[PDB]
Design a protein around this ligand. Structure first.
Ligand SMILES: *[C@@H]1O[C@H](CO)[C@@H](O)[C@H](O)[C@H]1NC(C)=O
Ligand SMILES: *[C@@H]1O[C@H](CO)[C@@H](O)[C@H](O)[C@H]1NC(C)=O
Ligand SMILES: *[C@@H]1O[C@H](CO)[C@@H](O)[C@H](O)[C@H]1NC(C)=O
Ligand SMILES: *[C@@H]1O[C@H](CO)[C@@H](O)[C@H](O)[C@H]1NC(C)=O
Ligand SMILES: *[C@@H]1O[C@H](CO)[C@@H](O)[C@H](O)[C@H]1NC(C)=O
Lengths: 299, 204
């Protein structure tokens, strides 16, 4: 009233509001984990020149699987920070797996050239993804040598990123036609990474899987886990039921949603009920209690 | 044959996943106009524009699947829905098959009577609604088309063909409808707000 003496009567003073206590988050059962054990745990890593794309689109990107081998020496991110990357929407994931040698792995990095980053492979300096280091040369190297690491050694120019060069064209480095035979400056464009389990830190085998992400105009289908919380009812909470954040009280409902129906509405288009993603249940939503606060006073 | 038949009041799907009970809802969407005319093909390929209303009655499983996407092969990818009576496989990895059916693979989704189907592309999603009805021909009456799938394939589709009767075809148009949800979210009746002035009054 902006006055010190209050006349006898009833006055509207404030607006009582029940406030939420918990922040409920509900998302469906975490299924269809993205295939990574086939690329992270495999002894048939492709050759550096003969690398292979990996198609990973229709699944949940369990990006935290990197902690299956937390002894990773390095996990250098190049597209985005991992904290943000636990939930990011991309249209496709392309991974390639190979082993080159020792300390040459620094060549698998933005702004790097030479050998591996020259003709065997290369990545653009704006590369999106991460480069990992879990060298397991214990079985990759044998005292017999393992010269079977088929790797291209020669090429006319630098290798374009994300292109496969299985060509076997002789490096005619001399001023004389080669005709494919081995004469002078005529050597087969491929050589050997024969490594025994005694080589140096820059010559022993390695363990490489690098994966990149992309997002074109097609809608994104690559996403991380949603981490749904528990479900609690009969008290004002802050729920998030897969597409809609709202403050309200959830109660058991007798509504009969059709099997395909998620939301629930009434006149004026306000969400009155929700189907729970994890367990198939119908929860009615009631707005948290509120209302004016009148003060009955004598003078 | 390319006869033409009245569409009656057919080809109404659920516009979204929202539940509604005992309410009349006015929605603007790609609907098949009431009492329109529809081809009754038994033609190489029909176009797509902005959605179709494929329907069929032949239970012999001879109308097996469909082909979508611009052109037919070797470019811009092509959807290849093919049924198998046990598997309902959908492939977006084109077969490169002949023009009269009987590559960079990227999608391999797997899952007396009248069958009604609606296909649409809005923005990167191929939505398929469908419905079965024990018809006692497109009978007069009403039966809403419950959604089946919402594929996230980002193709651009302009024409379509069909695998191999009752090759009904109708074309969706942007229309405003007034749908009725009886008490359980089932669309029991609809009013086409541009058919006749009485329906305009009903929608108003
Ligand atoms: C989700 O998983 C729980 C755990 O057993 C199960 O009871 C429930 O039926 C599942 N729901 C769906 C939709 O898969
Ligand atoms: C629409 O279908 C009717 C059905 O008989 C047909 O007579 C008419 O010619 C069709 N309209 C056009 C423009 O073809
Ligand atoms: C239909 O095709 C799918 C695709 O792999 C296959 O799994 C299924 O067995 C086929 N159906 C029959 C009856 O062969
Ligand atoms: C699909 O390709 C481009 C990219 O979306 C688009 O501009 C074009 O109009 C489309 N082509 C069709 C619909 O035939
Ligand atoms: C709607 O639900 C009722 C149960 O309340 C049941 O008779 C039937 O499934 C539907 N009835 C009508 C008239 O739509």
């Amino acid at each position: 009233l902006k006055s010190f003496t209050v006349e006898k009567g009833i006055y509207q003073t404030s607006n009582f509001r029940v406030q939420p206590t918990e922040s409920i988050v509900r998302f469906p059962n975490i299924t269809n984990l993205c295939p990574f054990d086939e690329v992270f745990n495999a002894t048939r890593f492709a050759s550096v020149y003969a690398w292979n794309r990996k198609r990973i689109s229709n699944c949940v990107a369990d990006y935290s699987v990197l902690y299956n081998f937390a002894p990773f020496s390095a996990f250098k991110c190049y597209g985005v920070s991992p904290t943000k990357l636990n939930d990011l929407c991309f249209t496709n994931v392309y991974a390639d797996s190979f082993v080159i040698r020792g300390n040459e792995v620094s060549q698998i990095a933005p702004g790097q050239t030479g050998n591996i980053a020259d003709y065997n492979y290369k990545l653009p300096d704006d590369f999106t993804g991460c480069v990992i280091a879990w060298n397991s040369n214990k079985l990759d190297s044998k005292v017999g040598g393992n010269y079977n690491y088929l790797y291209r050694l020669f090429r006319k120019s630098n290798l374009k990123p994300f292109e496969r060069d299985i060509s076997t064209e002789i490096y005619q480095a001399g001023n004389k036609p080669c005709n494919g035979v081995a004469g002078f400056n005529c050597y087969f464009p491929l050589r050997s990474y024969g490594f025994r389990p005694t080589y140096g830190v820059g010559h022993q085998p390695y363990r490489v899987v690098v994966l990149s992400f992309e997002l074109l105009h097609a809608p994104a289908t690559v996403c991380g886990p949603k981490k749904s919380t528990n479900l609690v009812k009969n008290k004002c909470v802050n729920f998030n039921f897969n597409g809609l954040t709202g403050t309200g009280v959830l109660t058991e409902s007798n509504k009969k949603f059709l099997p395909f129906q998620q939301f629930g509405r009434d006149i004026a288009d306000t969400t009155d009920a929700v189907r729970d993603p994890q367990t198939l249940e119908i929860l009615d939503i009631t707005p948290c209690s509120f209302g004016g606060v009148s003060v009955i006073t004598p003078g | 044959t390319q006869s033409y038949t009245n569409s009656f009041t057919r080809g109404v799907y659920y516009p979204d996943k929202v539940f509604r009970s005992s309410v009349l809802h006015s929605t603007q969407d790609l609907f098949l106009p009431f009492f329109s005319n529809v081809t009754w093909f038994h033609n190489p390929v029909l176009p797509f524009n902005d959605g179709v209303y494929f329907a069929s009655t032949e239970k012999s499983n001879i109308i097996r699947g469909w082909i979508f996407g611009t052109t037919l092969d070797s470019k811009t990818q092509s959807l290849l829905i093919v049924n198998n009576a046990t598997n309902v496989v959908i492939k977006v990895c084109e077969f490169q098959f002949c023009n009269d059916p009987f590559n960079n693979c990227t999608f391999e989704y797997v899952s007396k009577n009248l069958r009604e189907f609606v296909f649409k592309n809005i923005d990167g999603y191929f939505k398929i609604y469908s419905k079965h009805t024990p018809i006692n021909d497109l009978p007069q009456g009403f039966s809403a088309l419950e959604p089946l799938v919402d594929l996230p394939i980002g193709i651009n589709i302009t024409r379509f063909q069909t695998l191999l009767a009752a090759y009904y075809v109708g074309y969706l148009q942007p229309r405003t409808f007034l749908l009725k949800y009886n008490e359980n979210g089932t669309i029991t009746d609809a009013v086409d707000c541009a058919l006749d002035p009485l329906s305009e009054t009903k929608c108003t």
